[PDB]
Design goal:
Chain lengths: 329, 329
């Protein structure tokens, strides 16, 4: 008699028990992404679905699941959902706002420090067993007195600026919408154009929203404008950086380093899409620092994201209007 | 011509050029520490020596260098030098000011972020070639809302608190001498006793000033007072942490992780000293993050340390009292 809820990815045990009171839960007991054909097979008979980044909810999917009443996305964005198809199928579509902002900002700063201070090579030198004390090796670039530019001053850009404000750097940003005077003073951040940003910075951090004019914002033309010996940190999205232009800039000496949490191969919304991370990047351990999309990979934050998606599902199944709904079926 | 200067370790080419105007320079072209016998072979007819952390200047060394007039240490301390033997042999011994504060504070925060966000294991997964997109793995621990305590509040601890002030944490500290009230308010850092710090902190950062080093400040008793699942970050000095006690606390689950830039095996002035970093720490890549004494490994600080040591040698060779002298020959 109970409705069934399918969760496409692993969630904390507490979240399953929370949903259990009002629904029969079909969980993913592994840490892997199930093939789409297996997700659809489990959801065919489901009244609710918790969706994650690798899910692509199109009309084809909805047509296979005629009982669906709510998709609770454990996500802030909904680029992978055909919203109006959900509406036409009578399916609530809900999202979770804002929770990824701060952990993404903290990770971006972690990537900056790990890359500029050669910390990965440093750890490999320790694990080798040959550490016998200080050596004149792995001299990096410090933060204080340097110029860092944030391209895009949305929620994550503001979180980064607030955190770097204590580091005695020269902080620049560009955005079509300026911060107010109170914010610029509190964080000591100076508005410039994008061309000025690229001209002046030792460190360039893109954090722009998704748009057509965002594709390869950092291309060969942009890298040519940047300071020789600068560093680029990308925890925004794979499509904002031309990874092949980065490879060329690392080889020529234009870039001293590239760090990334995100990769072009992730974009399943694109046709000119690579299938792996370029080998020239994977091989270049001296100049790169990578993480596998860990921007929100904080246990406490993931639990609260799953909790919000679960509450949205419970609310919708109870005939309420879900707190994170973006449509109205 | 004319006086000869031996540099025991590699220095930036501009330092070579600076010394060359008044001296014939015998550089270490490698990033390795020379064996003692080779240093003596170079210095036997040198007028000046630039010394670094791995050097050890005793009476026996000086007896083999009858022309030596000055040893310029590229170091803020002089533990490794028999100062009175220098004096007796007519040799100036000079040091440089402490310039390590800010890059050590920056590295400590990099260690904290790298450790808590599983960034090394993340990089290993990217380089494995098997990344296929976001997955519910490598969930770490966040900063915002958590409690971090700095044990000791000297120059480096103040630098850390200033930088963490923007991270929306609960910052605690303990020190026999309080910060002034404007700093406690500006950084939102609260003074507690050591026992209260250990009890309340998710993150513990020993950073005692030079005047207050305690052997094994963090030992089995301290770790038993800490929160289960806490993290410990040591960029202060090898001797302040009982590494065998840390190994046991990682094994029991008391500590979720340990990161360090310094190691007990470095203490060449203590007698109960080990020769290698313990194997159980080196093997534990899941729960540790290590760097090979990189606290001040930033080009700008290394360059300034070398410059001041060279200027001291230049002054002493010209018959002046060098600015960084610690003795009177």
């Amino acid at each position: 008699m109970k409705p069934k809820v399918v969760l496409t990815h692993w969630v904390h045990p507490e979240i399953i028990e929370l949903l259990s009171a009002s629904a029969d839960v079909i969980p993913n007991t592994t840490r892997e992404t199930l093939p789409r054909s297996e997700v659809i097979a489990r959801a065919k008979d489901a009244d609710a679905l918790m969706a994650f980044m690798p899910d692509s909810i199109d009309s084809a999917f909805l047509e296979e699941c005629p009982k669906l009443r709510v998709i609770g996305a454990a996500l802030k964005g909904y680029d992978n959902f055909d919203v109006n198809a959900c509406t036409r199928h009578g399916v609530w579509l809900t999202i979770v706002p804002d929770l990824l902002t701060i952990p993404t900002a903290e990770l971006t700063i972690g990537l900056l420090l790990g890359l500029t201070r050669h910390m990965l090579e440093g750890d490999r030198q320790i694990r080798s067993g040959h550490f016998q004390g200080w050596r004149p090796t792995l001299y990096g670039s410090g933060l204080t007195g340097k110029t860092l530019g944030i391209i895009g001053m949305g929620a994550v850009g503001r979180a980064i600026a607030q955190r770097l404000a204590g580091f005695e750097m020269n902080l620049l940003y560009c955005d079509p919408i300026p911060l107010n005077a109170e914010q610029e003073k509190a964080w000591h951040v100076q508005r410039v154009t994008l061309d000025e940003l690229l001209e002046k910075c030792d460190y360039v951090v893109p954090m722009v929203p998704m748009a057509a004019e965002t594709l390869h914002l950092i291309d060969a033309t942009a890298l040519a404008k940047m300071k020789t010996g600068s560093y680029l940190i990308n925890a925004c999205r794979g499509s904002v950086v031309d990874e092949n232009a980065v490879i060329a800039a690392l080889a020529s000496g234009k870039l001293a380093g590239y760090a990334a949490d995100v990769f072009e191969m992730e974009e399943w919304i694109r046709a000119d899409r690579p299938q792996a991370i370029p080998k020239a990047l994977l091989d270049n351990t001296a100049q790169t620092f990578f993480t596998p999309h860990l921007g929100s990979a904080v246990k406490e934050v993931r639990l609260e994201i799953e909790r919000q998606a679960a509450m949205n599902i419970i609310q919708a199944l109870a005939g309420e209007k879900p707190m994170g709904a973006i449509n109205q079926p």
